[PDB]
């Protein structure tokens, strides 16, 4: 299975999303974006 980020994986015939990894990606992106936006004012 090939990883494509945000919990998205694909075989040679099917693609799917890992919900836990997607949620973790969203949370981490949220925290990092908030920190970088507030640190750059």
């Amino acid at each position: 299975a090939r990883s494509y980020g945000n919990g998205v994986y694909c075989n040679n015939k099917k693609c799917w999303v890992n919900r836990g990894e997607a949620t973790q990606s969203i949370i981490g992106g949220m925290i990092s974006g908030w920190a970088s936006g507030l640190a750059g004012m």
Binding site: G5, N6, S25, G28, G29, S32, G33, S36, G40, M41
Partner: protein, 106 residues
Amino acid sequence: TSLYKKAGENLYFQGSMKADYKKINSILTYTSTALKNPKIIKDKDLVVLLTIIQEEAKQNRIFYDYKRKFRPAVTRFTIDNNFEIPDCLVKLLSAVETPKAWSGFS
């Protein structure tokens, strides 16, 4: 045809082109004007950044603010100055590079 050369630079490096003389002269003039402003002089970080920019302009080069520090410093100075900014800083706001791509947080 200078725009195509600038696009090639932006896709390859920073400062690899001629750094056309009119922009350099304007940057030098505005930095000299700003460094003679007592309110600006009271601000040490802004003075340091303007000195760096003027040093780059003296060698016909544009400052590559890869840390993205100059514009937040100008904003801080403007806020501390009762939300007022001299024209020199307004004209110098468009004198840095600010890297042009990134990959996202995920």
